[PDB]
Design a binder for these strands. Structure first.
Length: 54
DNA sequence: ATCTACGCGTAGATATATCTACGTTTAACAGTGGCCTTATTAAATGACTTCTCCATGATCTAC
């Protein structure tokens, strides 16, 4: 939330923020930076067993 | 390799930034009826101290 409230052009701390975030999301860094928004959303919804569909 | 200067990493101190949100029921009522025990009985039996312990003087009798 802080990273999304601060200026978006500001870089994010890799090991401090992104790697733990994708870790808790059960998502590889490759999947996060490579897949499009549709695939990422579908995989996130399946990972947390949500019923959403983007 | 060594002396000297300087730019940087870093730790400490400090000001800042954090979007929704609002409106959160207005109305009218908060039982109207009637009763609030009718009968009957208000004990029937028998017992209501049980006992001593008397006071005083005439008389008998022993020393």
């Amino acid at each position: 939330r802080i990273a999304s409230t601060t200026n978006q052009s500001q870089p994010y701390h890799l090991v401090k923020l992104i790697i733990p975030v994708c870790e808790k999301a059960k998502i590889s860094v490759f999947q996060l930076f490579g897949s499009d928004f549709k695939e990422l959303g579908k995989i996130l919804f399946g990972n947390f067993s949500l019923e959403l569909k983007l």
